[PDB]
Symmetry: C3
Subunit: 276 residues, 3 copies
């Protein structure tokens, strides 16, 4: 209700978004937008959440994020050897040692995160990027040059290996973000985009690139999945052949299904050695 | 005469480059080199350009860039939590807020650019790197951990997705740089290099790796192209089989062709859904 | 001997590491750990090395590196526009011009390196990351968004193209690091992980992904290698088909063997 009234401000401002700019927005609307982003930043709110077993996307939070662009000017940011120019502030810009100590994760230079993304305890941010509206749950490792795009929901004990990208979804408002459920491993150079949902304890190896159009071939059943990686799927890069046999095109291949559970990297590597 | 005088200084210098050092360079030559880098930085000059439907490379600008290296010593660059040591200054180190504001683009930390690359209005540099001599035109998105290599020419309204690399080209002086023409989409994790030209309105998916080494198979005609993606090509990764079918080898496949133009990512999404 | 004594202090500490925290770590233990990391940082010690022509892995160095995390607290690190919070010091934080001049490599912003990795002379780090216990030898290029993981050994006159990741191997503790031998070219977007050894003078094309499970198919002999790219191999991405041909899965393919100019080597695909 306090929350209902916050949402009210957002839904009202967004309907008139066309005429909102940094120099005309009233103080109530600004503070409200900023409060939402603050709640997203602390994980008190989140853009999508799993309710009664289904992923629900809260449109009004995406409105809030969009409005946060519209109401803030780009500003110069001092970078020591370089300068920047952007309108989304840095999550940690203000964090002090006490706050870092209390929240219990690690941010490894030059890893950065935009204000408005939630990073949970026992996470390790290797040099990587986490965009606004994202949620990175406890125990998760984000490896070097990995990216957690806007609004993505990364569960607990997830491993985003080096250079793995999880695609942002801000617009359309109605579209769910990309979702990597608890215990998932995503191997080096892989990309999961466009609101694909990787169910819990899946194991995606290197260089597996999955958007909504990507064929996920279940070699056991012969079925082609789109848009969703079944829980416990072990998935690797492959191709499907043309009717000809004269060429073949990329796909992901489900090559084993395992029980969905927290796994070490050593464990993952050993499971990937266990495939035909 | 001014530009003729400049080019002549550079080419004359470059002829005797073996005898030019940071310690021994006269100020006229130093000034001429640094002024050419400034012209490339502001987009007043550009390493290659399209004249009469034809891409022309200007060797002398490549010679300028190469001499900019030769005449400058490495120097310690303070970076807050770390220090660097290099001889190419940083484009934005001297940018004030007014300059950023009039030039109309955004630089999202930790994105950086070397001095001597042009960045046009309405582009957004997510964390990324733009090397010396490159040209990134209006309304382009350079997404997280992407790279625009030396001398690369990126067109207007291009989307370089996360992890995309556009390969640098200095030597040979004669070689056209890597060119991405207007309205191109390039999917996450892709690399285009070695003066490959991606013609306008093309859509390259994820995980596409194209150099002069790469077969570009038109599955509609069965023809292999090298070094060029024809305008409006929709390109995905695939493989072509050995004569006996024992193995197959990576290639890029043109799966269909569209009529090149201004885009939305409703239509990028939807173009790839019709893929076979 | 002093080195034997150092190794014993490290191994004894490793043995009772479950008892050791930043809070209770004693100065003898700390000094020995920190001293090993200093030696790794200067290249005086290295995690694996080629002895009598084979690679030898010094597990106790891996134990020191592992312990260096356990015994240190995270600290806030001021970063201009942002702040960090981590427990491994930055290699260059206190370098001055004279030291850069002496060690003779370049560090292109925003390239960074953790303390406890050795960079040799005439190497160029484009924006990249070199993790603790790595050794990057002379005349090597580490191009933009490359990554040299924990303990990885990169040889002389190696080209790690843009977006090339060399996997860390702290654990398992027993494993050798990922190794790129001398004179190798690694094409952009490639990733070589899990202790794979890429032998000298190999040419790996773009977008090649090799871990310990990756079939490296020799199209000439029909061999399938695991874990090792043979010296002077030219390597590209490919697939190996299923029995019935319904689908195919990723591999590497050795498409020629050359003694010891790249684009001509690669522009031959059949
Ligand atoms: Mg910085």
């Amino acid at each position: 209700q306090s929350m209902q009234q916050l949402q009210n401000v957002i839904e009202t401002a967004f309907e008139r978004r066309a005429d909102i700019t940094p120099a005309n927005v009233d103080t109530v609307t600004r503070e409200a937008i900023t409060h939402v982003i603050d709640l997203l930043d602390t994980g008190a709110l989140r853009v999508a959440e799993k309710i009664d077993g289904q992923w629900v996307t809260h449109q009004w939070l995406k409105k809030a994020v969009l409005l946060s662009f519209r109401i803030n000017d780009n500003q110069v940011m001092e970078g020591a050897e370089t300068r920047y120019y952007d309108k989304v502030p840095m999550k940690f810009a203000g964090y002090d040692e006490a706050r870092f100590q209390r929240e219990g994760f690690r941010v490894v230079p030059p890893a950065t995160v935009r204000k408005g993304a939630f990073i949970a305890r026992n996470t390790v941010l290797m040099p990587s990027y986490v965009n606004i509206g994202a949620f990175v749950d406890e125990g998760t490792m984000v490896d070097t040059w990995a990216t957690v795009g806007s609004c993505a929901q990364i569960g607990k004990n997830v491993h985003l290996s080096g250079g793995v990208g999880i695609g942002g979804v801000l617009e359309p408002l109605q579209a769910n973000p990309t979702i990597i459920e608890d215990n998932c491993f995503v191997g080096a150079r892989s990309e999961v985009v466009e609101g694909v949902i990787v169910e819990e304890g899946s194991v995606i190896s290197m260089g597996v690139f999955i958007g909504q159009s990507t064929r996920i071939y279940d070699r056991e059943t012969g079925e082609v999945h789109y848009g969703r990686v079944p829980a416990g799927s072990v998935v690797v890069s492959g191709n499907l052949p043309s009717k000809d046999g004269s060429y073949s095109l990329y796909c992901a291949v489900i090559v084993k299904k395992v029980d969905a559970k927290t796994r070490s990297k050593v464990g993952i590597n050993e499971l990937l050695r266990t495939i035909d």
